[PDB]
């Protein structure tokens, strides 16, 4: 490959053969991160200003993927990306991604890759991406993922771009939730990706690519629901959320190809914690396909229990990662007596509860955690398992830990 200053000098001579050959040479050496050199930064910024001028006038269909690939490489550098944060620049990339509001697969992927880098780091690009309404045809392409057909990497970066837009812009988040039927659209995309219907066999194992797309779908669903779901919900919004919860029930029961299972269960449970509390009853709505407890299938509740144990092993200071699963389990225990007795039997058999490495000793230690969120939910979880009896709660957890649920907060 050749150095940025050489590429810029190649364009200055203007011979079409030296230009493309310089771009493709640069694209091969700099496609990996070990090539990026602090010393060549001003040459990269110089090259970025040249290329945004070309991109904004338009890219010829041949060499189009070559130009975008250079822009995509340059966009990894923070100091070069503002050169591209313009209406004309984003609009040009939106067209080559075919999400401009007004089918070359490799041009599509490179533009989506460019747009992901641009909006991620620039408040101006975030403002321009919202104004350009890229979310509309981004969502419409996701809905047509069955009728139409796109490669997995295009599908992934559509969802990644959708994730970034909903994460970085409140107004894009509201648009997808309130006016673009985002929950229904992405619940549909999740079922297609999972390959199972709500009422079918519990999904056992998900392929690696489907896991990547499904996790992105779960993250977008998290974005548009952590903010906008009032906890009281009508009959139409209850059924979709129950429909979605049944898909999340599959995710809980299943593993992900490779070692992505716990990350896959992390995004599933995070979303479960966003649903209206009443819709969590789907987690107890399994038939026997095998863990029976007082007539109720506890396999889902047992699976959330295993995930809770796994993540308590694997987190030093980030115990907050288990607050979603604890609140889901708490409301299951609070709403359903058989789930409460099972969880108490599994966690709390009949002197210093904070000592040990059984599951109950680890949960009790969370009751005094630094993160206020996780110390209160772990406290309420065990309090509910104790049938909300303060004496029993104190006996099983010790008064120093149980005080975080009584007003005796502040004596300690």
mmCIF file of N, CA and C in Angstrom, residues 32-166:
data_model
loop_
_atom_site.group_PDB
_atom_site.id
_atom_site.type_symbol
_atom_site.label_atom_id
_atom_site.label_comp_id
_atom_site.label_asym_id
_atom_site.label_seq_id
_atom_site.Cartn_x
_atom_site.Cartn_y
_atom_site.Cartn_z
ATOM 1 N N UNK A 32 -6.869 -2.332 7.827
ATOM 2 C CA UNK A 32 -6.680 -2.836 9.177
ATOM 3 C C UNK A 32 -6.099 -1.741 10.065
ATOM 4 N N UNK A 33 -6.391 -1.838 11.364
ATOM 5 C CA UNK A 33 -6.105 -0.744 12.284
ATOM 6 C C UNK A 33 -4.616 -0.544 12.540
ATOM 7 N N UNK A 34 -3.784 -1.572 12.356
ATOM 8 C CA UNK A 34 -2.369 -1.399 12.674
ATOM 9 C C UNK A 34 -1.654 -0.461 11.710
ATOM 10 N N UNK A 35 -2.289 -0.081 10.599
ATOM 11 C CA UNK A 35 -1.652 0.822 9.645
ATOM 12 C C UNK A 35 -1.755 2.281 10.077
ATOM 13 N N UNK A 36 -2.788 2.634 10.840
ATOM 14 C CA UNK A 36 -3.030 4.034 11.161
ATOM 15 C C UNK A 36 -1.877 4.615 11.966
ATOM 16 N N UNK A 37 -1.322 5.711 11.458
ATOM 17 C CA UNK A 37 -0.118 6.330 11.989
ATOM 18 C C UNK A 37 -0.442 7.759 12.394
ATOM 19 N N UNK A 38 -0.124 8.109 13.644
ATOM 20 C CA UNK A 38 -0.304 9.483 14.104
ATOM 21 C C UNK A 38 0.444 10.470 13.217
ATOM 22 N N UNK A 39 1.609 10.065 12.704
ATOM 23 C CA UNK A 39 2.426 10.974 11.906
ATOM 24 C C UNK A 39 1.736 11.365 10.604
ATOM 25 N N UNK A 40 0.897 10.487 10.057
ATOM 26 C CA UNK A 40 0.212 10.737 8.795
ATOM 27 C C UNK A 40 -1.152 11.392 8.982
ATOM 28 N N UNK A 41 -1.418 11.971 10.155
ATOM 29 C CA UNK A 41 -2.758 12.473 10.446
ATOM 30 C C UNK A 41 -3.131 13.641 9.538
ATOM 31 N N UNK A 42 -2.228 14.616 9.387
ATOM 32 C CA UNK A 42 -2.526 15.759 8.528
ATOM 33 C C UNK A 42 -2.694 15.337 7.075
ATOM 34 N N UNK A 43 -1.979 14.295 6.648
ATOM 35 C CA UNK A 43 -2.181 13.765 5.305
ATOM 36 C C UNK A 43 -3.546 13.096 5.180
ATOM 37 N N UNK A 44 -3.999 12.418 6.238
ATOM 38 C CA UNK A 44 -5.334 11.824 6.217
ATOM 39 C C UNK A 44 -6.410 12.900 6.188
ATOM 40 N N UNK A 45 -6.237 13.963 6.979
ATOM 41 C CA UNK A 45 -7.190 15.066 6.951
ATOM 42 C C UNK A 45 -7.175 15.772 5.601
ATOM 43 N N UNK A 46 -5.987 15.950 5.017
ATOM 44 C CA UNK A 46 -5.903 16.502 3.669
ATOM 45 C C UNK A 46 -6.639 15.618 2.670
ATOM 46 N N UNK A 47 -6.439 14.301 2.755
ATOM 47 C CA UNK A 47 -7.134 13.385 1.856
ATOM 48 C C UNK A 47 -8.640 13.408 2.092
ATOM 49 N N UNK A 48 -9.063 13.568 3.350
ATOM 50 C CA UNK A 48 -10.490 13.590 3.656
ATOM 51 C C UNK A 48 -11.175 14.798 3.028
ATOM 52 N N UNK A 49 -10.510 15.955 3.037
ATOM 53 C CA UNK A 49 -11.111 17.147 2.450
ATOM 54 C C UNK A 49 -11.231 17.017 0.937
ATOM 55 N N UNK A 50 -10.232 16.405 0.291
ATOM 56 C CA UNK A 50 -10.338 16.129 -1.138
ATOM 57 C C UNK A 50 -11.520 15.218 -1.437
ATOM 58 N N UNK A 51 -11.696 14.170 -0.631
ATOM 59 C CA UNK A 51 -12.672 13.135 -0.947
ATOM 60 C C UNK A 51 -14.101 13.569 -0.660
ATOM 61 N N UNK A 52 -14.307 14.436 0.334
ATOM 62 C CA UNK A 52 -15.660 14.924 0.577
ATOM 63 C C UNK A 52 -16.100 15.831 -0.561
ATOM 64 N N UNK A 53 -15.157 16.537 -1.189
ATOM 65 C CA UNK A 53 -15.501 17.320 -2.369
ATOM 66 C C UNK A 53 -15.976 16.416 -3.497
ATOM 67 N N UNK A 54 -15.306 15.279 -3.690
ATOM 68 C CA UNK A 54 -15.708 14.350 -4.741
ATOM 69 C C UNK A 54 -17.035 13.684 -4.393
ATOM 70 N N UNK A 55 -17.194 13.252 -3.140
ATOM 71 C CA UNK A 55 -18.413 12.547 -2.751
ATOM 72 C C UNK A 55 -19.638 13.450 -2.862
ATOM 73 N N UNK A 56 -19.475 14.742 -2.573
ATOM 74 C CA UNK A 56 -20.617 15.648 -2.571
ATOM 75 C C UNK A 56 -21.062 16.032 -3.978
ATOM 76 N N UNK A 57 -20.166 15.986 -4.968
ATOM 77 C CA UNK A 57 -20.610 16.170 -6.344
ATOM 78 C C UNK A 57 -21.203 14.898 -6.935
ATOM 79 N N UNK A 58 -20.847 13.731 -6.400
ATOM 80 C CA UNK A 58 -21.388 12.481 -6.896
ATOM 81 C C UNK A 58 -20.326 11.484 -7.309
ATOM 82 N N UNK A 59 -20.571 10.206 -7.052
ATOM 83 C CA UNK A 59 -19.621 9.164 -7.405
ATOM 84 C C UNK A 59 -20.100 8.409 -8.640
ATOM 85 N N UNK A 60 -19.229 8.325 -9.645
ATOM 86 C CA UNK A 60 -19.498 7.523 -10.832
ATOM 87 C C UNK A 60 -19.744 6.067 -10.443
ATOM 88 N N UNK A 61 -20.668 5.371 -11.117
ATOM 89 C CA UNK A 61 -20.994 3.993 -10.699
ATOM 90 C C UNK A 61 -19.788 3.066 -10.654
ATOM 91 N N UNK A 62 -18.890 3.154 -11.630
ATOM 92 C CA UNK A 62 -17.614 2.463 -11.539
ATOM 93 C C UNK A 62 -16.644 3.304 -10.720
ATOM 94 N N UNK A 63 -15.871 2.634 -9.864
ATOM 95 C CA UNK A 63 -15.007 3.208 -8.835
ATOM 96 C C UNK A 63 -15.802 3.751 -7.652
ATOM 97 N N UNK A 64 -17.137 3.706 -7.697
ATOM 98 C CA UNK A 64 -17.947 4.202 -6.586
ATOM 99 C C UNK A 64 -17.599 3.489 -5.285
ATOM 100 N N UNK A 65 -17.543 2.155 -5.322
ATOM 101 C CA UNK A 65 -17.188 1.388 -4.137
ATOM 102 C C UNK A 65 -15.749 1.661 -3.711
ATOM 103 N N UNK A 66 -14.877 2.052 -4.646
ATOM 104 C CA UNK A 66 -13.507 2.395 -4.278
ATOM 105 C C UNK A 66 -13.447 3.703 -3.491
ATOM 106 N N UNK A 67 -14.224 4.712 -3.901
ATOM 107 C CA UNK A 67 -14.239 5.979 -3.173
ATOM 108 C C UNK A 67 -14.823 5.805 -1.776
ATOM 109 N N UNK A 68 -15.971 5.129 -1.679
ATOM 110 C CA UNK A 68 -16.618 4.943 -0.384
ATOM 111 C C UNK A 68 -15.718 4.175 0.574
ATOM 112 N N UNK A 69 -14.957 3.208 0.056
ATOM 113 C CA UNK A 69 -14.065 2.434 0.910
ATOM 114 C C UNK A 69 -12.946 3.303 1.470
ATOM 115 N N UNK A 70 -12.452 4.261 0.683
ATOM 116 C CA UNK A 70 -11.477 5.200 1.227
ATOM 117 C C UNK A 70 -12.116 6.090 2.286
ATOM 118 N N UNK A 71 -13.328 6.585 2.018
ATOM 119 C CA UNK A 71 -14.043 7.388 3.007
ATOM 120 C C UNK A 71 -14.303 6.572 4.267
ATOM 121 N N UNK A 72 -14.706 5.307 4.101
ATOM 122 C CA UNK A 72 -14.965 4.448 5.254
ATOM 123 C C UNK A 72 -13.711 4.255 6.096
ATOM 124 N N UNK A 73 -12.554 4.098 5.448
ATOM 125 C CA UNK A 73 -11.299 3.967 6.182
ATOM 126 C C UNK A 73 -10.965 5.271 6.897
ATOM 127 N N UNK A 74 -11.073 6.394 6.183
ATOM 128 C CA UNK A 74 -10.761 7.688 6.781
ATOM 129 C C UNK A 74 -11.705 8.019 7.930
ATOM 130 N N UNK A 75 -12.940 7.512 7.885
ATOM 131 C CA UNK A 75 -13.930 7.843 8.902
ATOM 132 C C UNK A 75 -13.626 7.215 10.257
ATOM 133 N N UNK A 76 -12.726 6.232 10.319
ATOM 134 C CA UNK A 76 -12.301 5.696 11.607
ATOM 135 C C UNK A 76 -11.490 6.706 12.409
ATOM 136 N N UNK A 77 -10.911 7.709 11.747
ATOM 137 C CA UNK A 77 -10.138 8.748 12.415
ATOM 138 C C UNK A 77 -11.073 9.873 12.846
ATOM 139 N N UNK A 78 -11.049 10.183 14.143
ATOM 140 C CA UNK A 78 -11.891 11.228 14.715
ATOM 141 C C UNK A 78 -11.736 12.554 13.980
ATOM 142 N N UNK A 79 -10.491 13.005 13.802
ATOM 143 C CA UNK A 79 -10.221 14.345 13.294
ATOM 144 C C UNK A 79 -10.539 14.509 11.813
ATOM 145 N N UNK A 80 -10.804 13.423 11.089
ATOM 146 C CA UNK A 80 -11.159 13.523 9.680
ATOM 147 C C UNK A 80 -12.662 13.559 9.447
ATOM 148 N N UNK A 81 -13.456 13.118 10.423
ATOM 149 C CA UNK A 81 -14.855 12.818 10.152
ATOM 150 C C UNK A 81 -15.720 14.064 10.036
ATOM 151 N N UNK A 82 -15.344 15.166 10.689
ATOM 152 C CA UNK A 82 -16.138 16.382 10.561
ATOM 153 C C UNK A 82 -16.110 16.936 9.144
ATOM 154 N N UNK A 83 -15.080 16.600 8.363
ATOM 155 C CA UNK A 83 -15.064 16.989 6.959
ATOM 156 C C UNK A 83 -16.276 16.442 6.218
ATOM 157 N N UNK A 84 -16.847 15.335 6.698
ATOM 158 C CA UNK A 84 -17.983 14.686 6.054
ATOM 159 C C UNK A 84 -19.317 14.998 6.719
ATOM 160 N N UNK A 85 -19.327 15.749 7.821
ATOM 161 C CA UNK A 85 -20.568 16.004 8.554
ATOM 162 C C UNK A 85 -21.302 17.188 7.921
ATOM 163 N N UNK A 86 -21.910 16.922 6.766
ATOM 164 C CA UNK A 86 -22.645 17.944 6.035
ATOM 165 C C UNK A 86 -23.909 17.341 5.437
ATOM 166 N N UNK A 87 -24.871 18.218 5.132
ATOM 167 C CA UNK A 87 -26.114 17.779 4.500
ATOM 168 C C UNK A 87 -25.835 17.048 3.196
ATOM 169 N N UNK A 88 -25.054 17.672 2.312
ATOM 170 C CA UNK A 88 -24.762 17.078 1.014
ATOM 171 C C UNK A 88 -23.988 15.774 1.154
ATOM 172 N N UNK A 89 -23.109 15.685 2.151
ATOM 173 C CA UNK A 89 -22.312 14.476 2.324
ATOM 174 C C UNK A 89 -23.164 13.325 2.844
ATOM 175 N N UNK A 90 -23.966 13.576 3.883
ATOM 176 C CA UNK A 90 -24.840 12.527 4.399
ATOM 177 C C UNK A 90 -25.896 12.132 3.376
ATOM 178 N N UNK A 91 -26.457 13.111 2.659
ATOM 179 C CA UNK A 91 -27.443 12.799 1.628
ATOM 180 C C UNK A 91 -26.847 11.910 0.544
ATOM 181 N N UNK A 92 -25.610 12.198 0.125
ATOM 182 C CA UNK A 92 -24.949 11.351 -0.863
ATOM 183 C C UNK A 92 -24.785 9.928 -0.345
ATOM 184 N N UNK A 93 -24.347 9.783 0.908
ATOM 185 C CA UNK A 93 -24.197 8.452 1.484
ATOM 186 C C UNK A 93 -25.546 7.781 1.708
ATOM 187 N N UNK A 94 -26.588 8.566 1.989
ATOM 188 C CA UNK A 94 -27.921 7.997 2.156
ATOM 189 C C UNK A 94 -28.436 7.411 0.848
ATOM 190 N N UNK A 95 -28.122 8.058 -0.276
ATOM 191 C CA UNK A 95 -28.550 7.541 -1.572
ATOM 192 C C UNK A 95 -27.848 6.229 -1.901
ATOM 193 N N UNK A 96 -26.530 6.170 -1.694
ATOM 194 C CA UNK A 96 -25.791 4.945 -1.980
ATOM 195 C C UNK A 96 -26.112 3.838 -0.986
ATOM 196 N N UNK A 97 -26.681 4.183 0.165
ATOM 197 C CA UNK A 97 -27.278 3.209 1.065
ATOM 198 C C UNK A 97 -28.749 2.966 0.753
ATOM 199 N N UNK A 98 -29.305 3.702 -0.214
ATOM 200 C CA UNK A 98 -30.709 3.599 -0.618
ATOM 201 C C UNK A 98 -31.661 3.789 0.559
ATOM 202 N N UNK A 99 -31.289 4.644 1.510
ATOM 203 C CA UNK A 99 -32.187 5.056 2.579
ATOM 204 C C UNK A 99 -32.510 6.539 2.524
ATOM 205 N N UNK A 100 -32.045 7.249 1.499
ATOM 206 C CA UNK A 100 -32.444 8.635 1.306
ATOM 207 C C UNK A 100 -33.945 8.701 1.067
ATOM 208 N N UNK A 101 -34.608 9.638 1.748
ATOM 209 C CA UNK A 101 -36.065 9.622 1.794
ATOM 210 C C UNK A 101 -36.672 9.835 0.409
ATOM 211 N N UNK A 102 -36.032 10.633 -0.440
ATOM 212 C CA UNK A 102 -36.544 10.865 -1.786
ATOM 213 C C UNK A 102 -36.262 9.670 -2.693
ATOM 214 N N UNK A 103 -29.544 -2.868 -7.542
ATOM 215 C CA UNK A 103 -29.204 -2.973 -6.120
ATOM 216 C C UNK A 103 -27.776 -3.469 -5.887
ATOM 217 N N UNK A 104 -26.817 -2.545 -5.921
ATOM 218 C CA UNK A 104 -25.403 -2.877 -5.763
ATOM 219 C C UNK A 104 -25.111 -3.125 -4.287
ATOM 220 N N UNK A 105 -24.899 -4.393 -3.927
ATOM 221 C CA UNK A 105 -24.786 -4.760 -2.518
ATOM 222 C C UNK A 105 -23.515 -4.207 -1.885
ATOM 223 N N UNK A 106 -22.411 -4.170 -2.635
ATOM 224 C CA UNK A 106 -21.145 -3.742 -2.052
ATOM 225 C C UNK A 106 -21.078 -2.231 -1.863
ATOM 226 N N UNK A 107 -21.725 -1.463 -2.741
ATOM 227 C CA UNK A 107 -21.869 -0.032 -2.500
ATOM 228 C C UNK A 107 -22.773 0.209 -1.298
ATOM 229 N N UNK A 108 -23.840 -0.585 -1.176
ATOM 230 C CA UNK A 108 -24.757 -0.455 -0.048
ATOM 231 C C UNK A 108 -24.029 -0.636 1.280
ATOM 232 N N UNK A 109 -23.237 -1.706 1.393
ATOM 233 C CA UNK A 109 -22.555 -2.000 2.649
ATOM 234 C C UNK A 109 -21.561 -0.905 3.017
ATOM 235 N N UNK A 110 -20.844 -0.367 2.029
ATOM 236 C CA UNK A 110 -19.812 0.621 2.328
ATOM 237 C C UNK A 110 -20.423 1.938 2.799
ATOM 238 N N UNK A 111 -21.566 2.325 2.232
ATOM 239 C CA UNK A 111 -22.228 3.554 2.663
ATOM 240 C C UNK A 111 -22.789 3.409 4.072
ATOM 241 N N UNK A 112 -23.472 2.292 4.342
ATOM 242 C CA UNK A 112 -23.953 2.021 5.693
ATOM 243 C C UNK A 112 -22.805 2.030 6.693
ATOM 244 N N UNK A 113 -21.667 1.438 6.320
ATOM 245 C CA UNK A 113 -20.489 1.490 7.178
ATOM 246 C C UNK A 113 -20.033 2.927 7.395
ATOM 247 N N UNK A 114 -20.023 3.733 6.330
ATOM 248 C CA UNK A 114 -19.659 5.141 6.462
ATOM 249 C C UNK A 114 -20.628 5.869 7.383
ATOM 250 N N UNK A 115 -21.932 5.691 7.150
ATOM 251 C CA UNK A 115 -22.935 6.372 7.960
ATOM 252 C C UNK A 115 -22.841 5.974 9.426
ATOM 253 N N UNK A 116 -22.510 4.712 9.710
ATOM 254 C CA UNK A 116 -22.355 4.298 11.101
ATOM 255 C C UNK A 116 -21.199 5.033 11.767
ATOM 256 N N UNK A 117 -20.095 5.228 11.042
ATOM 257 C CA UNK A 117 -18.956 5.940 11.613
ATOM 258 C C UNK A 117 -19.266 7.423 11.795
ATOM 259 N N UNK A 118 -19.982 8.018 10.840
ATOM 260 C CA UNK A 118 -20.275 9.449 10.875
ATOM 261 C C UNK A 118 -21.180 9.816 12.045
ATOM 262 N N UNK A 119 -22.321 9.131 12.174
ATOM 263 C CA UNK A 119 -23.273 9.532 13.207
ATOM 264 C C UNK A 119 -22.751 9.188 14.595
ATOM 265 N N UNK A 120 -21.890 8.175 14.702
ATOM 266 C CA UNK A 120 -21.441 7.723 16.014
ATOM 267 C C UNK A 120 -20.703 8.818 16.777
ATOM 268 N N UNK A 121 -19.948 9.666 16.079
ATOM 269 C CA UNK A 121 -18.995 10.553 16.730
ATOM 270 C C UNK A 121 -19.257 12.038 16.523
ATOM 271 N N UNK A 122 -20.260 12.418 15.738
ATOM 272 C CA UNK A 122 -20.469 13.820 15.396
ATOM 273 C C UNK A 122 -21.860 14.277 15.818
ATOM 274 N N UNK A 123 -21.982 15.223 16.755
ATOM 275 C CA UNK A 123 -23.309 15.787 17.054
ATOM 276 C C UNK A 123 -23.968 16.416 15.843
ATOM 277 N N UNK A 124 -23.177 17.015 14.950
ATOM 278 C CA UNK A 124 -23.719 17.580 13.719
ATOM 279 C C UNK A 124 -24.298 16.487 12.830
ATOM 280 N N UNK A 125 -23.556 15.390 12.653
ATOM 281 C CA UNK A 125 -24.063 14.282 11.852
ATOM 282 C C UNK A 125 -25.292 13.657 12.496
ATOM 283 N N UNK A 126 -25.322 13.599 13.830
ATOM 284 C CA UNK A 126 -26.511 13.110 14.517
ATOM 285 C C UNK A 126 -27.708 14.010 14.237
ATOM 286 N N UNK A 127 -27.495 15.327 14.265
ATOM 287 C CA UNK A 127 -28.558 16.266 13.929
ATOM 288 C C UNK A 127 -28.990 16.108 12.474
ATOM 289 N N UNK A 128 -28.026 15.936 11.567
ATOM 290 C CA UNK A 128 -28.344 15.833 10.147
ATOM 291 C C UNK A 128 -29.021 14.510 9.821
ATOM 292 N N UNK A 129 -28.620 13.432 10.499
ATOM 293 C CA UNK A 129 -29.244 12.137 10.252
ATOM 294 C C UNK A 129 -30.716 12.151 10.647
ATOM 295 N N UNK A 130 -31.048 12.828 11.749
ATOM 296 C CA UNK A 130 -32.446 12.960 12.148
ATOM 297 C C UNK A 130 -33.223 13.807 11.148
ATOM 298 N N UNK A 131 -32.663 14.959 10.775
ATOM 299 C CA UNK A 131 -33.328 15.859 9.838
ATOM 300 C C UNK A 131 -33.580 15.181 8.495
ATOM 301 N N UNK A 132 -32.665 14.313 8.066
ATOM 302 C CA UNK A 132 -32.801 13.632 6.785
ATOM 303 C C UNK A 132 -33.812 12.496 6.819
ATOM 304 N N UNK A 133 -34.327 12.146 8.000
ATOM 305 C CA UNK A 133 -35.358 11.119 8.151
ATOM 306 C C UNK A 133 -34.887 9.763 7.637
ATOM 307 N N UNK A 134 -33.594 9.471 7.810
ATOM 308 C CA UNK A 134 -33.053 8.183 7.388
ATOM 309 C C UNK A 134 -33.752 7.014 8.066
ATOM 310 N N UNK A 135 -34.377 7.244 9.225
ATOM 311 C CA UNK A 135 -35.001 6.156 9.970
ATOM 312 C C UNK A 135 -36.185 5.571 9.206
ATOM 313 N N UNK A 136 -36.845 6.374 8.368
ATOM 314 C CA UNK A 136 -38.058 5.917 7.689
ATOM 315 C C UNK A 136 -37.748 4.736 6.774
ATOM 316 N N UNK A 137 -36.925 4.961 5.749
ATOM 317 C CA UNK A 137 -36.626 3.889 4.807
ATOM 318 C C UNK A 137 -35.641 2.871 5.367
ATOM 319 N N UNK A 138 -34.908 3.223 6.424
ATOM 320 C CA UNK A 138 -34.163 2.218 7.174
ATOM 321 C C UNK A 138 -35.115 1.206 7.801
ATOM 322 N N UNK A 139 -36.189 1.695 8.426
ATOM 323 C CA UNK A 139 -37.177 0.801 9.021
ATOM 324 C C UNK A 139 -37.953 0.040 7.951
ATOM 325 N N UNK A 140 -38.314 0.718 6.858
ATOM 326 C CA UNK A 140 -39.071 0.066 5.794
ATOM 327 C C UNK A 140 -38.273 -1.059 5.145
ATOM 328 N N UNK A 141 -36.950 -0.908 5.050
ATOM 329 C CA UNK A 141 -36.129 -1.995 4.528
ATOM 330 C C UNK A 141 -36.097 -3.174 5.494
ATOM 331 N N UNK A 142 -36.107 -2.897 6.800
ATOM 332 C CA UNK A 142 -36.107 -3.974 7.788
ATOM 333 C C UNK A 142 -37.415 -4.757 7.726
ATOM 334 N N UNK A 143 -38.541 -4.059 7.562
ATOM 335 C CA UNK A 143 -39.817 -4.746 7.471
ATOM 336 C C UNK A 143 -39.918 -5.657 6.264
ATOM 337 N N UNK A 144 -39.244 -5.300 5.171
ATOM 338 C CA UNK A 144 -39.278 -6.070 3.936
ATOM 339 C C UNK A 144 -38.195 -7.143 3.875
ATOM 340 N N UNK A 145 -37.588 -7.493 5.012
ATOM 341 C CA UNK A 145 -36.500 -8.465 5.011
ATOM 342 C C UNK A 145 -36.951 -9.864 4.606
ATOM 343 N N UNK A 146 -38.256 -10.130 4.574
ATOM 344 C CA UNK A 146 -38.766 -11.404 4.077
ATOM 345 C C UNK A 146 -39.062 -11.334 2.580
ATOM 346 N N UNK A 147 -39.872 -10.356 2.165
ATOM 347 C CA UNK A 147 -40.182 -10.193 0.748
ATOM 348 C C UNK A 147 -38.914 -9.956 -0.065
ATOM 349 N N UNK A 148 -38.115 -8.967 0.330
ATOM 350 C CA UNK A 148 -36.842 -8.710 -0.322
ATOM 351 C C UNK A 148 -35.759 -9.608 0.275
ATOM 352 N N UNK A 149 -34.527 -9.439 -0.202
ATOM 353 C CA UNK A 149 -33.415 -10.270 0.251
ATOM 354 C C UNK A 149 -32.130 -9.459 0.204
ATOM 355 N N UNK A 150 -31.441 -9.378 1.338
ATOM 356 C CA UNK A 150 -30.189 -8.648 1.454
ATOM 357 C C UNK A 150 -29.171 -9.489 2.210
ATOM 358 N N UNK A 151 -27.883 -9.337 1.897
ATOM 359 C CA UNK A 151 -26.849 -10.106 2.604
ATOM 360 C C UNK A 151 -26.851 -9.814 4.099
ATOM 361 N N UNK A 152 -26.244 -10.732 4.857
ATOM 362 C CA UNK A 152 -26.273 -10.627 6.314
ATOM 363 C C UNK A 152 -25.572 -9.364 6.804
ATOM 364 N N UNK A 153 -24.461 -8.988 6.163
ATOM 365 C CA UNK A 153 -23.695 -7.829 6.617
ATOM 366 C C UNK A 153 -24.438 -6.526 6.333
ATOM 367 N N UNK A 154 -25.172 -6.458 5.219
ATOM 368 C CA UNK A 154 -26.044 -5.312 4.984
ATOM 369 C C UNK A 154 -27.125 -5.264 6.057
ATOM 370 N N UNK A 155 -27.769 -6.408 6.314
ATOM 371 C CA UNK A 155 -28.805 -6.469 7.341
ATOM 372 C C UNK A 155 -28.260 -6.051 8.701
ATOM 373 N N UNK A 156 -27.028 -6.458 9.018
ATOM 374 C CA UNK A 156 -26.445 -6.128 10.316
ATOM 375 C C UNK A 156 -26.219 -4.627 10.455
ATOM 376 N N UNK A 157 -25.662 -3.993 9.423
ATOM 377 C CA UNK A 157 -25.338 -2.576 9.523
ATOM 378 C C UNK A 157 -26.559 -1.681 9.360
ATOM 379 N N UNK A 158 -27.630 -2.174 8.733
ATOM 380 C CA UNK A 158 -28.911 -1.481 8.830
ATOM 381 C C UNK A 158 -29.364 -1.410 10.281
ATOM 382 N N UNK A 159 -29.335 -2.552 10.973
ATOM 383 C CA UNK A 159 -29.745 -2.591 12.370
ATOM 384 C C UNK A 159 -28.785 -1.804 13.250
ATOM 385 N N UNK A 160 -27.478 -1.936 13.005
ATOM 386 C CA UNK A 160 -26.500 -1.153 13.754
ATOM 387 C C UNK A 160 -26.733 0.340 13.558
ATOM 388 N N UNK A 161 -26.926 0.767 12.305
ATOM 389 C CA UNK A 161 -27.266 2.162 12.047
ATOM 390 C C UNK A 161 -28.558 2.550 12.752
ATOM 391 N N UNK A 162 -29.577 1.685 12.675
ATOM 392 C CA UNK A 162 -30.823 1.935 13.392
ATOM 393 C C UNK A 162 -30.572 2.061 14.890
ATOM 394 N N UNK A 163 -29.722 1.190 15.439
ATOM 395 C CA UNK A 163 -29.370 1.272 16.853
ATOM 396 C C UNK A 163 -28.721 2.613 17.182
ATOM 397 N N UNK A 164 -27.739 3.030 16.378
ATOM 398 C CA UNK A 164 -27.040 4.279 16.664
ATOM 399 C C UNK A 164 -27.987 5.469 16.576
ATOM 400 N N UNK A 165 -28.856 5.490 15.565
ATOM 401 C CA UNK A 165 -29.786 6.606 15.414
ATOM 402 C C UNK A 165 -30.726 6.706 16.608
ATOM 403 N N UNK A 166 -31.287 5.575 17.041
ATOM 404 C CA UNK A 166 -32.209 5.620 18.172
ATOM 405 C C UNK A 166 -31.476 5.878 19.484
#
